[PDB]
Amino acid sequence: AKAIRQTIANLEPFMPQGMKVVYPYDTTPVVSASIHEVVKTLGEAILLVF
C-alpha cells in the first residue's frame, strides 16, 4: 500500500490541471491499528506480569 502511495506520488507531477487522486476506501489503517494494539498489549502484558 505504501508502494501504491509512492507510485501515485511519483506520477503526480505529470497529471493534467484539475485532477486530484483521492483515496476513499482503504483498509490499511484497520490492519495497522489491529496489529499495533496487539503489540501494545504484548508490551503491557509482559510489563504488567513483571
Binding site: 507531477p13 505529470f14 493534467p16 490541471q17
Partner: protein, 34 residues
C-alpha cells in the same frame, strides 16, 4: 489556420516541449526554428 481560443497578440510555445506543463512559470526566448 486557427479560428477560436487563440486571438491576435498571443504567444505559443514551439520548441523545448519536454520540461513544461500548464501551470508553471517558464522564461522566454525567441524561437530557433522558423
Amino acid at each position: 489556420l486557427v479560428t477560436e481560443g487563440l486571438n491576435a497578440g498571443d504567444k505559443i510555445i514551439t520548441e523545448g516541449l519536454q520540461f513544461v506543463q500548464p501551470g508553471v512559470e517558464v522564461k522566454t526566448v525567441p524561437a530557433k526554428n522558423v
